[PDB]
Amino acid sequence: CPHSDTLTIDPMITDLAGETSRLRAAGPLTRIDLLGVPALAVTGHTLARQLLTDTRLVKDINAWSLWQSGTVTRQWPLIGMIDVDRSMFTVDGPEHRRLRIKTTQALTRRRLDALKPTIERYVAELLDDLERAGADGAVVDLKSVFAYPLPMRVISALMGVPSEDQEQLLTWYKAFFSILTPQDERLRVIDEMHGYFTEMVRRKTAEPGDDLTSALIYATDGETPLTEEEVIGNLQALVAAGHETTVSLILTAVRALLSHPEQLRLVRDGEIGWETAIEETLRWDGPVIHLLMRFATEDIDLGDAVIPRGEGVVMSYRAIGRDITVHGADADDFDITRATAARHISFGHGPHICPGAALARLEAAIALPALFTRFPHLHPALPLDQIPNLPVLTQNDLSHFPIHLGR
Numbered sequence: 232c233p234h235s236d237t238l239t240i241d242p243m244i245t246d247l248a249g250e251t252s253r254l255r256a257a258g259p260l261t262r263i264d265l266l267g268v269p270a271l272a273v274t275g276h277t278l279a280r281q282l283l284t285d286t287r288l289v290k291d292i293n294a295w296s297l298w299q300s301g302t303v304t305r306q307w308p309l310i311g312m313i314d315v316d317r318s319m320f321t322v323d324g325p326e327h328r329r330l331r332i333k334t335t336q337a338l339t340r341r342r343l344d345a346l347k348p349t350i351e352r353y354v355a356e357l358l359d360d361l362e363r364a365g366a367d368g369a370v371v372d373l374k375s376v377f378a379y380p381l382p383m384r385v386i387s388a389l390m391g392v393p394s395e396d397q398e399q400l401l402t403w404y405k406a407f408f409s410i411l412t413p414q415d416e417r418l419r420v421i422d423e424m425h426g427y428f429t430e431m432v433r434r435k436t437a438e439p440g441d442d443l444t445s446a447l448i449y450a451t452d453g454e455t456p457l458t459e460e461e462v463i464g465n466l467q468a469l470v471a472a473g474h475e476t477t478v479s480l481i482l483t484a485v486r487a488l489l490s491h492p493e494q495l496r497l498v499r500d501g502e503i504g505w506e507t508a509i510e511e512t513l514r515w516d517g518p519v520i521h522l523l524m525r526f527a528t529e530d531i532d533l534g535d536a537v538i539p540r541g542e543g544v545v546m547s548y549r550a551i552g553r554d555i556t557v558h559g560a561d562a563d564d565f566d567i568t569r570a571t572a573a574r575h576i577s578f579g580h581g582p583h584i585c586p587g588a589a590l591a592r593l594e595a596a597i598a599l600p601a602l603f604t605r606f607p608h609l610h611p612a613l614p615l616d617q618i619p620n621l622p623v624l625t626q627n628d629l630s631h632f633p634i635h636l637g638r
């Protein structure tokens with residue numbers, strides 16, 4: 232269809248592959264349209280690396296000229312992705328580290344050793360649900376039975392979300408992410424999520440436990456305490472991210488491996504590490520499509536192009552993972568043996584780099600082999616290429632994943 236010099240991101244995710252190719256080819260910096268709102272998108276690996284460390288690009292929505300003019304408001308269906316409370320997510324500079332430190336420390340690989348048994352238990356529980364559900368050769372939704380609930384259980388255990396509240400959170404998130412949710416109802420869901428997590432912080436304040444939320448509340452020894460807004464802001468970021476991204480990584484890793492059986496075999500037979508298959512999945516078909524937004528505090532000259540003060544900059548991570556300069560001409564193929572499998576930046580780069588990356592990697596490294604060892608003849612009951620995305624513009628969110636447990 233006709234040549235346009237603004238690339239409209241289709242909210243129905245009708246053509247993710249085409250849109251992702253279009254972006255790579257239009258880049259590495261190009262003009263996009265997000266439901267009527269213009270922004271720049273970084274689609275190049277090298278330029279993203281550089282801009283993710285540029286101190287003239289900030290998260291603070293008040294640096295967005297469109298926000299300042301009141302051209303964008305809370306009616307924008309994408310607004311909840313950025314206009315959120317003070318947290319590691321919305322801060323830049325020297326104040327940023329303070330908002331990250333207790334979380335990074337809690338999520339180092341060895342601190343995570345103690346969470347391992349827990350993850351194991353939940354993976355086993357849900358494989359048991361799979362077995363029950365796939366009985367008598369029935370078709371089973373791998374997402375709803377397995378991949379969807381696992382990461383919620385895990386992040387909930389970490390942060391101290393009661394078992395009985397986890398369902399309602401999922402109901403809220405589904406509403407939150409879907410473009411289809413009416414905007415007034417989305418804003419109501421956002422207020423309701425905020426109210427929940429506020430009360431959770433109060434509950435942990437009265438009665439702290441061995442959880443990260445309690446550690447955010449009562450920090451080291453001397454330190455300058457986080458404010459209520461900050462504790463709540465981090466909590467929300469950790470849960471939302473911790474759940475939504477991980478569900479995708481599991482589903483795409485499976486889809487990838489089932490659609491490339493020789494590669495599944497490589498890892499089953501211990502010739503390639505499940506971890507490496509995980510990295511390649513992040514590079515190729517990762518959890519984040521577009522990362523909303525950064526803003527220029529002043530004009531940013533890049534050579535033959537300029538990001539004007541006030542402009543919105545999006546990191547188009549999926550397009551970045553398909554960078555042919557970095558990954559070679561076969562960048563669009565899934566190949567776990569490629570030499571650049573782990574050179575991606577799908578968790579980001581610079582100060583805002585994903586703090587939960589070790590946890591994400593561990594959830595997958597446990598879930599995937601457990602899944603395939605338990606159900607070695609697991610296979611799709613629907614062509615993998617026919618698994619549609621949910622209308623979720625920023626996230627690689629698969630709708631459902633019909634399988635059979637197999638022989």
Ligand code: HEM
Pocket residue numbers: 319320321331386468469470472473474476477480517518519522546548577578579580582583584585586587588590591592
């Ligand atoms: C499973 C795959 C995951 C991917 C691909 C992913 C990716 C990302 C990306 C791209 C960012 C922001 C990059 C940017 O600022 O431009 C980010 C930030 C974040 N992620 Fe993740 N993430 C994952 C899992 C998790 C998990 C498991 C948690 C928490 C347990 C988590 C918590 C966060 C938080 C709190 C931030 C905000 C950090 C900041 O702005 O300072 N993520 N992640």
Ligand SMILES: C[C@]12CCC(=O)C=C1CC[C@@H]1[C@@H]2CC[C@]2(C)C(=O)CC[C@@H]12
Pocket residue numbers: 311312313315320467468469471472475476518519522626
């Ligand atoms: C915007 C958001 C939800 C609403 C909220 O209150 C707090 C956050 C912060 C983390 C965001 C998350 C939505 C999805 C994001 C973009 C990811 O895929 C990784 C980080 C994560």
Ligand SMILES: [K+]
Pocket residue numbers: 314315316
């Ligand atoms: K707000």
Ligand SMILES: [Mg+2]
Pocket residue numbers: 234235236
């Ligand atoms: Mg043109």
